[PDB]
Amino acid sequence: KNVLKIRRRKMNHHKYRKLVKKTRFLRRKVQEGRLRRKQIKFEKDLRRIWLKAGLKEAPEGWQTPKIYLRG
Amino acid sequence: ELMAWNQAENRRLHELRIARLRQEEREQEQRQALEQARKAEEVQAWAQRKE
Amino acid sequence: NPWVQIMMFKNMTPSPFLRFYLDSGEQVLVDVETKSNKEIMEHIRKILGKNEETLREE
Amino acid sequence: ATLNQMHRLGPPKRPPRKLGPTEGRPQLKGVVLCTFTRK
Amino acid sequence: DPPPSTLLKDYQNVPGIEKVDDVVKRLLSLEMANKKEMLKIKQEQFMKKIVANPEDTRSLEARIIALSVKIRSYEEHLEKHRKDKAHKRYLLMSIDQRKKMLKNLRNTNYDVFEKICWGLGIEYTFPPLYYRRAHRRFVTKKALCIRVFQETQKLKKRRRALKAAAAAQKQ
Amino acid sequence: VRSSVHARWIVGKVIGTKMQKTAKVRVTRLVLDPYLLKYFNKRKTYFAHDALQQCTVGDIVLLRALPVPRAKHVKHELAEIVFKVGKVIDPVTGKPCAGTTYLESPLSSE
RNA sequence: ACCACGAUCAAAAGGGACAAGCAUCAAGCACGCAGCAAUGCAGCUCAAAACGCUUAGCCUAGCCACACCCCCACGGGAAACAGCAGU
Ligand SMILES: NC(=O)c1ccc[n+]([C@@H]2O[C@H](COP(=O)([O-])OP(=O)(O)OC[C@H]3O[C@@H](n4cnc5c(N)ncnc54)[C@H](O)[C@@H]3O)[C@@H](O)[C@H]2O)c1
Ligand SMILES: [K+]
Ligand SMILES: [Mg+2]
Ligand SMILES: [Mg+2]
Ligand SMILES: [Mg+2]
Ligand SMILES: [Mg+2]
Ligand SMILES: [Mg+2]
Ligand SMILES: [Mg+2]
Ligand SMILES: [Mg+2]
Ligand SMILES: [Mg+2]
Numbered sequence: 021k022n023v024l025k026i027r028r029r030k031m032n033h034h035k036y037r038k039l040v041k042k043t044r045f046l047r048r049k050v051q052e053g054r055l056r057r058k059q060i061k062f063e064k065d066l067r068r069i070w071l072k073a074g075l076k077e078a079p080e081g082w083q084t085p086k087i088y089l090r091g
Numbered sequence: 092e093l094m095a096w097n098q099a100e101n102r103r104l105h106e107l108r109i110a111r112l113r114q115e116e117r118e119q120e121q122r123q124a125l126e127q128a129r130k131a132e133e134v135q136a137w138a139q140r141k142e
Numbered sequence: 143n144p145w146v147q148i149m150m151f152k153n154m155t156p157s158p159f160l161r162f163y164l165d166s167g168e169q170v171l172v173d174v175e176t177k178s179n180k181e182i183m184e185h186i187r188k189i190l191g192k193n194e195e196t197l198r199e200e
Numbered sequence: 201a202t203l204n205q206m207h208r209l210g211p212p213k214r215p216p217r218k219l220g221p222t223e224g225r226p227q228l229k230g231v232v233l234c235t236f237t238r239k
Numbered sequence: 240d241p242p243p244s245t246l247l248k249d250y251q252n253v254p255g256i257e258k259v260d261d262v263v264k265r266l267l268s269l270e271m272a273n274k275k276e277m278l279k280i281k282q283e284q285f286m287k288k289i290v291a292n293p294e295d296t297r298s299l300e301a302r303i304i305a306l307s308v309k310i311r312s313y314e315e316h317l318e319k320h321r322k323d324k325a326h327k328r329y330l331l332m333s334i335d336q337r338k339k340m341l342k343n344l345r346n347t348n349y350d351v352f353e354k355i356c357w358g359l360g361i362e363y364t365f366p367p368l369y370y371r372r373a374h375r376r377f378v379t380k381k382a383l384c385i386r387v388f389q390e391t392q393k394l395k396k397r398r399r400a401l402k403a404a405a406a407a408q409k410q
Numbered sequence: 411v412r413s414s415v416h417a418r419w420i421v422g423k424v425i426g427t428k429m430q431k432t433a434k435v436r437v438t439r440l441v442l443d444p445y446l447l448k449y450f451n452k453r454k455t456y457f458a459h460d461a462l463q464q465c466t467v468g469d470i471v472l473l474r475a476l477p478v479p480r481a482k483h484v485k486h487e488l489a490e491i492v493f494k495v496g497k498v499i500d501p502v503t504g505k506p507c508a509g510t511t512y513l514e515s516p517l518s519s520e
Numbered sequence: 521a522c523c524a525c526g527a528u529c530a531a532a533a534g535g536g537a538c539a540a541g542c543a544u545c546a547a548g549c550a551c552g553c554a555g556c557a558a559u560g561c562a563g564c565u566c567a568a569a570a571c572g573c574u575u576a577g578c579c580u581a582g583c584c585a586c587a588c589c590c591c592c593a594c595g596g597g598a599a600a601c602a603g604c605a606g607u
Binding site for chain 7: 368369371377380381383384385387388391392
């Protein structure tokens with residue numbers, strides 16, 4: 021058979037890889053900011069829980085971990 | 092009256108079941124007799140080969 | 143009989159049987175081994191089904 | 201699909217209908233900003 | 240494991256095997272055989288210890304015992320061969336097949352199911368109701384929600400004593 | 411004889427025994443699929459009071475409605491264990507069975 | 521009329537049932553049980569779709585909801601045609 025459908029996908033993937041290459045430093049700064057907000061959004065969800073349960077502070081000895089950092 | 096008739100229908104079917112099971116034991120015993128005979132020869136043959 | 147619970151059980155016993163639970167608390171055991179499906183339907187109609195008169199009235 | 205599969209998914213769901221440029225309305229009032237010709 | 244001096248399952252019931260030379264006893268023992276021969280002795284030991292009819296090999300009990308011996312052999316194999324993915328697969332499949340057998344034995348013959356579990360040292364476990372990844376966000380939140388519950392319970396008990404104390408003072 | 415509970419008699423399978431004196435029972439009913447006109451099982455959970463804690467996960471039980479619910483979710487009591495898990499007694503013969511095989515022959519007691 | 525120790529009608533309460541789309545909303549976070557109580561146990565819901573977001577008055581002899589807004593209406597904002605005619 022022909023390979024015209026494969027060729028369309030080939031070009032799409034090539035241009036995508038080429039776009040990612042050109043903007044890989046901007047995309048890295050954007051990804052970092054998203055992970056920071058993701059961590060903040062997670063921290064708020066846990067604070068909402070203990071606050072809606074009647075507690076005024078986090079459970080004694082509880083520290084919310086950083087679950088989105090590369091480390 | 093219908094519950095009593097249903098209990099009587101169950102007893103009738105039970106008598107047929109006991110008759111059916113007795114005829115199956117006689118057949119089971121015949122088969123079980125041959126298998127033991129065959130199984131005994133195969134053991135004696137296997138025992139003689141090992142001896 | 144949309145409001146009657148019907149539950150099926152496979153291979154739990156050596157022979158097939160129907161059991162009905164009545165509001166009084168009585169239980170009706172119907173042995174169905176060796177019976178055709180048409181005989182089972184006619185049996186349970188006789189012992190626990192409304193007769194044609196009771197249905198005509200309704 | 202099997203009957204069990206058709207049961208699980210249920211009746212086919214139509215895609216929500218897209219509203220055109222009139223936003224599902226027969227006519228709209230407008231104020232002319234500019235006139236021109238198109239090829 | 241059975242002692243190495245144990246005779247093979249085939250030669251254990253031949254007449255006069257106890258009067259042969261010691262050399263002949265070594266050649267018909269487990270010491271001079273492959274591991275598969277030692278597993279046949281283990282299976283026979285479990286069959287006589289557990290099942291009612293040790294000669295019924297097609298019963299659900301015998302299959303669980305036979306498969307349990309294979310499972311132990313795979314575990315011993317993988318103890319020495321930890322990167323053997325082929326045998327790691329056979330072990331996990333065999334464990335799953337035994338659980339399916341135990342489920343069907345528990346449903347049909349509970350008295351025999353109990354003797355199989357005692358005899359083979361199996362702790363039957365019911366499967367989890369849901370299969371879903373416990374990722375970091377869920378694991379952390381579930382831990383926090385349990386700590387919040389534990390703290391709320393303590394505070395609710397310190398609101399019982401103060402109310403109790405004040406009520407007594409009125410008297 | 412009156413009760414405020416809707417389901418007066420229901421049979422189900424015990425799926426939980428972790429509550430004190432309470433068995434969690436899965437009850438299945440047949441429901442007609444209006445489009446396919448085929449009946450499919452619809453399952454509902456009922457809590458049943460089990461005073462003697464005699465219920466085992468997997469046994470078929472008969473539940474009777476209580477006159478009034480004894481708890482938020484406990485509206486029924488254990489009336490009868492129909493099929494004890496792995497210890498079924500054949501109702502037609504009264505003999506113990508393991509699946510489709512008899513453990514004691516009906517011919518033993520004639 | 522009066523009571524029916526009833527009938528009719530019909531609240532509150534208890535049980536059951538009850539829209540659509542989205543699973544890129546997949547976990548909810550106290551949502552259970554036992555006990556006269558004290559208190560004890562750690563459970564409860566959920567891919568057979570919980571929790572959640574969005575859309576919509578509905579199952580039309582009619583029904584539900586609302587009645588300027590703050591779900592409510594002591595209080596507050598404020599000064600009300602979603603009664604008819606009318607602007
Ligand atoms: N999700 C469960 O944990 C679960 C539990 C019991 C039965 N099932 C059955 O699994 C099938 C898939 O259900 P779906 O389409 O809603 O899920 P899905 O395929 O959309 O997967 C969603 C979640 O269910 C899990 N899952 C997927 N297939 C499963 C399977 N065969 N058995 C168990 N878990 C599975 C996935 O790992 C994921 O956590 C259905 O037949 C369902 O009845 C699923
Ligand atoms: K309002
Ligand atoms: Mg392209
Ligand atoms: Mg009401
Ligand atoms: Mg899915
Ligand atoms: Mg998206
Ligand atoms: Mg609206
Ligand atoms: Mg208002
Ligand atoms: Mg107005
Ligand atoms: Mg007007």
